[PDB]
Amino acid sequence: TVMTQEQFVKRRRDMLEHINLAMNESSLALEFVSLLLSSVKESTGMSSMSPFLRKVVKPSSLNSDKIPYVAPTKKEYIELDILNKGWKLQSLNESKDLLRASFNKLSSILQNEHDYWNKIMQSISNKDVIFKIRDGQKLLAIKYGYEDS
Amino acid sequence: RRRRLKKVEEEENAATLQLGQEFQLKQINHQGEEEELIALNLSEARLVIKEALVERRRAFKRSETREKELESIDVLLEQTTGGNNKDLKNTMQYLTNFSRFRDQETVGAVIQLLKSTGLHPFEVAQLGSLACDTADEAKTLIPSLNNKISDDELERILKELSNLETL
Amino acid sequence: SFDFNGVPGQALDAVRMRLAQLTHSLRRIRDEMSKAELPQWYTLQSQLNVTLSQLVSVTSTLQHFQETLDSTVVYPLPKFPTTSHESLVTTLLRKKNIPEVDEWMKYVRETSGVTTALLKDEEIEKLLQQDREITNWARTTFRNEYGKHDFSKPFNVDDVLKFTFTGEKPII
Amino acid sequence: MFFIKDLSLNITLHPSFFGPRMKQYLKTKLLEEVEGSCTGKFGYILCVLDYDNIDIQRGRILPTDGSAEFNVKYRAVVFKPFKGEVVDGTVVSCSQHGFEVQVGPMKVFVTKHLMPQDLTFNAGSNPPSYQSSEDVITIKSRIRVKIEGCISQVSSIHAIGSIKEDYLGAI
Amino acid sequence: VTPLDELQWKSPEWIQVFGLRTENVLDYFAESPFFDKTSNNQVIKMQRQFEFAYVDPARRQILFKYPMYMQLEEELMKLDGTEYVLSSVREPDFWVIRKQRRTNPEIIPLQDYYIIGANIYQSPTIFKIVQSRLMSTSYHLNSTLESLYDLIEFQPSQGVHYKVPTTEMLDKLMVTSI
Amino acid sequence: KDLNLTVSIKIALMNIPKPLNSYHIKNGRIYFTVPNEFEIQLSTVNRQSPLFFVDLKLLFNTNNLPLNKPRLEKLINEILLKSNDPLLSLYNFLHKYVLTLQLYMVHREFLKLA
Amino acid sequence: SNQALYEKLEQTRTILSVKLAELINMTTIADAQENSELAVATTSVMMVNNQ
């Protein structure tokens, strides 16, 4: 396949926006758990706060109380189990597609490399001299000069 | 300044917090002021020395599992430190094997968790170094903890640190 | 008066630590990739792997402390400004997640091939039981297939030179 | 025990190193006999921290030697052992007198009188080890040892280890 | 369908007719679906329509501050079952109502319901809050990781890398010219 | 066109040197040119502020020579306002620079002669 | 150099020998333990994005 500059920058921007949303959700989760921490401790939770949040709301402003211990029902057990089976199946299908695409890429690359090596053998005799060289990639350079002859 | 012999002093004992006149809590830095004595736990020492080595590598250029980390720090030592590195290499493999915490986030948050104790830097460095599992075990391993920390606070700190240690 | 005894002590600050590590690593990803030039691929792969390990540590900590966290409900306090900053608190205790994750979750639900709306619950129970038996058979097939296979000096230079300079024969 | 300390060293530069970039020869010469050097006053010096700025002031020519004397002040990470401290390590050698455990950059010897009596030497084992009813002390084995006596010379530090206390021994 | 925790309930029609103050939160919460229609609170409400131990000081301030709640709890101690009391108040607009069963006395608390801006909310437990946040975080990192993988290109001559998308003497000239 | 009038009346209060009396007030600029050497075009924003760099075209034949656009723009804008009269200092510095890379090209020809 | 290839091939082989097997193995349903949707989601992302 072929991929372009505009496609590259589009993919970069969309993964950037997705990871922005990721850190936003994680940061609100952390900031919530530290806000609830500051009610009882006030020492360690204040470190992970935001200065704007401390400006707009004072700590120790949340509270929790214990509802009694409850045994979860079997209906949501089988709901979670069937959702687990669906998630596993979808992950397996995604893995299959990933492995097939990577195999196709690897097979094309290996065909090119094996053609290169067969050309090297049918091209280069042991009398010739070859050494690696950098640009910084590895290239095989043959010395055809007479300076050592 | 007085020229007294002052040859009488107590022996340097970690149990009695005596670490020598050159290891007091207040240390005079090169800029002049008194500053708190810096005691590093083993993970903290490994992170600090690794940061120093990568800083020296960057200066030279401009001028995670244990197996993949040992080779990386070894080639870093080879490309960074010259001769007489046998002691440094022994120290780096020692800090790799005895690494309670891997990344900087764990070590720094362990420091701010131990700063809530308000205890001596040496004993909290020992707590970050030694992997004690019970409060009385830490008390008999570190005699400075006797009549210094509450048993329940020590228990929750140790079991917290057990939760904090990774891999 | 106000009290804070319904709050968990070690579960909550432990998950605060783990989530703080996750956020810090996400920030490291951000200032690693916000530049116009990407870093070389091994470092970013290591960052991705350590973030995945951090999140699996997060869910291990949370799932190991499953109960006594279902049992603690959160409510705000009068010290919280609930008039000029109730928009702050309504997206602070929310458990209704973003529409993308649960539309994908419902898409996952219908692609499982079996549902609840037209099947009775014990049929689902026996289907999950036989699926678990199939997992057991597959993993013991993998186990027996894995267990079927296995997983200089000819002389002394100094003595020769002592011969050539003195005449003493090399003693053997 | 590991520490970060500000140290000052008197360094003599030979007059051959009085070049246009004398400071970098002086910094390297600071490096090879401080990195890994053992001093009894400050412990085994491990690494010289903060290389970019190091306090190199004006150096005095020795009146009869001709070498320049620089009192270089620097910050370095050290490892100074003390009595009554508990350090973990690995055994690197064993004998009938005892075994030596490597702690950081330094080796600590644990004598035959400082193991519990259930531990006894077994020279027939390859490598030779100390065997007990519940555990063995072999080479390349993690062991927790408390240092109860250490001697430091002007350039060498040696310590005595013991594992007879409870919650010590192999890890 | 949306279950009981992810919904904000309000009756601004009831606010227009009656209005909400520190006294009429009980029937306003009774209009809410969170209220138990078989609770002890509503049977004693129908009957009445037709210092003190085993309480925390937070409710004691409410009882000594407002009378109608203290004869409410004085009628509530006679009966047993699930009840509804207000643990804390903040005028002009903040309330909380806790599910609570009482036995003889022994009291356990249950799910609370905090009131903000005359809007009834179910107090959520924090496990599903952080679980929903982790749903968002995990789905977002899933999308980033899938969207990143298509740019990755492997060659055998080099390492694995990214897909490549499809004068130097002038500073010396500047420094020599001055 | 009123900016062309602006830069035309700006040089009314400016004395013009003999090597740079050839100018073309056009395209919102004034084209200070020296034949077969260079042509620099400049403009200003108002009366009391000095001019600023716009472009510079080399009139010598090697053209299409690469130029480091913002370092040269930086020191041109530096020597504009800090100088007592801008045009003479700009002419002197630009003449020095063009003769400098002409000498560099001559040295390149000398080293390629070997 | 040539010694490092030995243990490199050894470690690649010993993780290929068990990784697909453990991928199949950890998809186990029980009431390891997945008592919430979070464990299900993190397993179904970690398999694809980690194995």
Curated annotation (Swiss-Prot), chain B:
One of its GO terms (biological process) is RNA-templated transcription. Belongs to the eukaryotic RPB4 RNA polymerase subunit family. One of its GO terms (cellular component) is cytoplasm. This is DNA-directed RNA polymerase II subunit RPB4. Component of the RNA polymerase II (Pol II) complex consisting of 12 subunits. RPB4 and RPB7 form a dissociable subcomplex associated with the 10-subunit Pol II core complex. In exponentially proliferating cells, only approximately 20 % of the Pol II complexes contain the RPB4-RPB7 subcomplex. In starving cells, that enter stationary phase, RPB4-RPB7 is associated with Pol II in a stoechiometric manner. The RPB4-RPB7 subcomplex probably associates with TFG1. Interacts with LSM2 and PAT1. Transmembrane segments: none annotated. One of its GO terms (molecular function) is nucleotide binding. It is found in: Nucleus; Cytoplasm; Cytoplasm, P-body. The gene is RPB4. Keywords: Acetylation, Cytoplasm, DNA-directed RNA polymerase, mRNA processing, Nucleus, Phosphoprotein, Transcription. The keyword Transferase does not apply.
UniProtKB/Swiss-Prot annotation, chain D:
It comes from the Eukaryota. Signal peptide: none annotated. Pfam families: S1, SHS2_Rpb7-N. GO terms for molecular function: single-stranded DNA binding; single-stranded RNA binding; translation initiation factor binding. One of its GO terms (biological process) is transcription initiation at RNA polymerase II promoter. InterPro entries: NA-bd_OB-fold (IPR012340), RNA_pol_Rpb7-like_N_sf (IPR036898), Rpb7-like (IPR045113), Rpb7-like_N (IPR005576), S1_domain (IPR003029). One of its GO terms (cellular component) is RPB4-RPB7 complex. CDD domains: RNAP_II_Rpb7_N, S1_RNAPII_Rpb7. The keyword Transit peptide does not apply. Keywords: Cytoplasm, DNA-directed RNA polymerase, Nucleus, Transcription. It is found in: Nucleus; Cytoplasm; Cytoplasm, P-body. DNA-dependent RNA polymerase catalyzes the transcription of DNA into RNA using the four ribonucleoside triphosphates as substrates. Component of RNA polymerase II which synthesizes mRNA precursors and many functional non-coding RNAs. Pol II is the central component of the basal RNA polymerase II transcription machinery. It is composed of mobile elements that move relative to each other. RPB7 is part of a subcomplex with RPB4 that binds to a pocket formed by RPB1, RPB2 and RPB6 at the base of the clamp element. Component of the RNA polymerase II (Pol II) complex consisting of 12 subunits. RPB4 and RPB7 form a subcomplex that protrudes from the 10-subunit Pol II core complex. The RPB4-RPB7 subcomplex probably associates with TFG1. Interacts with NRD1 and PAT1. Present with 6420 molecules/cell in log phase SD medium. Belongs to the eukaryotic RPB7/RPC8 RNA polymerase subunit family. This is DNA-directed RNA polymerase II subunit RPB7. The gene is RPB7.
Swiss-Prot record, chain G:
It comes from the Eukaryota. Transmembrane segments: none annotated. It is found in: Nucleus. The modification N-acetylserine is found at residue 1. Disulfide bonds: none annotated. Signal peptide: none annotated. Component of the Mediator complex, a coactivator involved in the regulated transcription of nearly all RNA polymerase II-dependent genes. Mediator functions as a bridge to convey information from gene-specific regulatory proteins to the basal RNA polymerase II transcription machinery. The Mediator complex, having a compact conformation in its free form, is recruited to promoters by direct interactions with regulatory proteins and serves for the assembly of a functional preinitiation complex with RNA polymerase II and the general transcription factors. Belongs to the Mediator complex subunit 22 family. Present with 2181 molecules/cell in log phase SD medium. Component of the Mediator complex, which is composed of at least 21 subunits that form three structurally distinct submodules. The Mediator head module contains MED6, MED8, MED11, SRB4/MED17, SRB5/MED18, ROX3/MED19, SRB2/MED20 and SRB6/MED22, the middle module contains MED1, MED4, NUT1/MED5, MED7, CSE2/MED9, NUT2/MED10, SRB7/MED21 and SOH1/MED31, and the tail module contains MED2, PGD1/MED3, RGR1/MED14, GAL11/MED15 and SIN4/MED16. The head and the middle modules interact directly with RNA polymerase II, whereas the elongated tail module interacts with gene-specific regulatory proteins. This is Mediator of RNA polymerase II transcription subunit 22. It comes from Saccharomyces cerevisiae (strain ATCC 204508 / S288c). The gene is SRB6. The chain holds residues 2 to 61 of 121 of the full protein.
